[PDB]
Write a protein that binds this ligand. Structure first.
Ligand SMILES: [Mg+2]
Lengths: 80, 80, 178, 113
RNA sequence: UGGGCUACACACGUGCUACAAUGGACAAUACAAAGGGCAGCGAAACCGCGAGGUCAAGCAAAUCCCAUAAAGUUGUUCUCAGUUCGGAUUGUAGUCUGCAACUCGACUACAUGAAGCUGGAAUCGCUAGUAAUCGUAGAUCAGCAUGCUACGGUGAAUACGUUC
């Protein structure tokens, strides 16, 4: 959770999916409804199709993006 | 040089208080304080907060450490 | 002439060894240091140039030459013959004193100094430096100056190439951005 | 002059130090405490030795351009990573989730009716 | 399950906080009312700059806790400016609640330091414990109030009068 004492929050289903990909030499696109899950350092190099509420928007994790939730990068509202 | 068209110019000692660096060069600036020099004369002394040796760039000393990487800060923050 | 002494001794040796100069005469030297100030604001107010002139006179240690417009431009509201600048040419001992002070005191005093640009050479071995404010120079006091104004310092070198000039300035101890 | 900035001479040192970027009243109190320089004594009346001591402490804290550069870099990174916060920075709209229907003038600038 | 109701060139209504010296900051030092509480109110002690945490007494209530009211009073300092006014915005590191604070919480620390120099035309409330001002409590409620509904403290000016 937010508090330091609690570990960085990640959804188990998202985490387990990433874990399987770690072993694989070539990573595959991940469909995730987990906007709330934090981007871990392990997530680097993984592509996540985060749901924007109507469609899944592709997100590629990089070093800089770590420590930011996957949901942040996907946009739920459209203007102009 | 034409006489009386130029501002008064005289040798003055420039001192870096921080690094205790003294050098004698001419300046229009007049100082009440004067100090004995290597040369057998007394010259007015100008005090400088920062000099070549004082300024970090010249020395190449780094005052502060570089910012932690995003992966690094994540690991450090939650001790993982 | 502490900077001159360096040039006379260690610097001469470094340059001649580096570029395999056949004669001592070949070794580069700084012909002149010229400080340029532009006062287009003088068009708007006569006082501004006069104030700048005072500042330049103190920093340089010699009276500046007022520079007048060659041609009239409507956009700049410029009229030919109007006073729009002040220049000083420092040569001989005065030059060496100015340069040593600039590198030793004034350039350090520059705010958030990251070194001088390495690319600021005309391609003919002559370097130009632009100071953002004249407050960096020690003589000027912050109270005395009403408005901060930049200055250009032009180092003209006998060096044929910039590289030779760069080595001369580096041996002089000029900060380089790298 | 401390940290490349000339603090007002007339004002008391404690307040004068706040003028330096990256220094606030809290730090200004702390830097004087470490310097062992009294807050009461005014900058104009400050002794030369005291001034040097203040400078040493101020140097230890990140101040002026170094802090400015860091802050800019963080904002640049957010814009680079295309973070929602970063996108709002690019839009020039409230970044921290303040409502934009009304108000939001400081971020949005003057009214264009 | 996730998003939206939290969109943002703008217009309007109702509010909140300022534009300082009848003030700002700091230190010391007083005087209320009306309410809430069982797995809830949580003292004290220790730890933290603080938000909090740790441990844990009492207390189903004229007993214990929320909870020290604040303005005030007396000193000290600043000295008429966009400031030692103001505190929007943004960066960073935290705390707490919750399965989960990305969209979209509250709070803290540090830094940053906007507009604002008392407001065009126009327009609102109030005849006394009222207005004005200063804090206090409660419902809803995991958390979340500048709103709402209650409470006291200090405490005015003026009303010739009925042409409009
Ligand atoms: Mg609604």
């Amino acid at each position: 959770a937010r508090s330091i004492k609690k570990g960085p929050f990640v959804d188990e289903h998202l985490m387990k999916k990433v874990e399987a990909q770690e072993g694989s030499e070539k990573k595959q696109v991940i469909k995730t409804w987990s906007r709330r899950s934090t981007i871990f350092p392990n997530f680097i190099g993984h592509t996540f199709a985060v749901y924007d509420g109507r469609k899944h928007v592709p997100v590629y994790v990089t070093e800089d993006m770590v420590g930011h939730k996957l949901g942040e990068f996907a946009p739920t509202r459209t203007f102009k | 040089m034409k006489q009386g068209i130029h501002p008064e110019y005289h040798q003055v000692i420039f001192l870096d208080t921080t690094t205790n660096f003294k050098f004698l060069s001419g300046s229009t600036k007049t100082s009440s304080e004067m100090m004995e020099w290597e040369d057998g004369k007394e010259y007015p002394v100008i005090r400088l907060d920062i000099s070549s040796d004082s300024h970090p760039f010249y020395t190449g000393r780094q005052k502060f450490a570089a910012a932690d990487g995003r992966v690094e800060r994540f690991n450090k923050k939650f001790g993982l | 002439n502490r900077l001159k002494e360096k040039f006379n001794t260690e610097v001469t040796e470094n340059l001649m060894k580096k570029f395999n100069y056949s004669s001592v005469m070949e070794v580069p030297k700084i012909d002149k240091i010229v400080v340029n100030m532009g006062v287009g604001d003088a068009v708007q107010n006569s006082k501004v140039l006069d104030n700048a002139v005072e500042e330049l006179e103190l920093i340089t240690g010699q009276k500046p030459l007022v520079t007048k417009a060659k041609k009239s431009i409507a956009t700049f509201r410029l009229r030919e013959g109007m006073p729009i600048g002040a220049k000083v040419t420092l040569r001989g001992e005065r030059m060496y004193e100015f340069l040593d002070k600039l590198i030793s005191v004034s350039l350090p005093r520059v705010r958030d100094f990251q070194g001088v640009s390495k690319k600021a050479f005309d391609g003919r071995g002559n370097y130009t430096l632009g100071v953002k404010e004249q407050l960096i120079f020690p003589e000027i006091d912050y109270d005395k100056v009403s408005k901060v104004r930049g200055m250009d310092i032009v180092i003209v070198t006998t060096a044929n190439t910039d590289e030779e000039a760069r080595e001369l300035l580096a041996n002089f101890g000029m900060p380089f951005r790298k | 002059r401390i940290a490349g900035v000339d603090i007002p001479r007339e004002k008391r040192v404690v307040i004068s130090l706040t003028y330096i970027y990256g220094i606030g009243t809290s730090t200004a109190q702390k830097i004087l405490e470490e310097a062992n320089v009294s807050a009461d004594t005014r900058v104009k009346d400050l002794t030369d030795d005291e001034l040097g001591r203040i400078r040493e402490v101020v140097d230890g804290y990140k101040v002026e351009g170094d802090l400015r550069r860091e802050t800019n870099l963080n904002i640049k990174r957010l814009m680079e990573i295309s973070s929602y916060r970063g996108i709002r920075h690019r839009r020039g709209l409230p970044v921290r989730g303040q409502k934009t229907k009304n108000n939001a003038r400081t971020r949005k600038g003057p009214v264009k009716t």
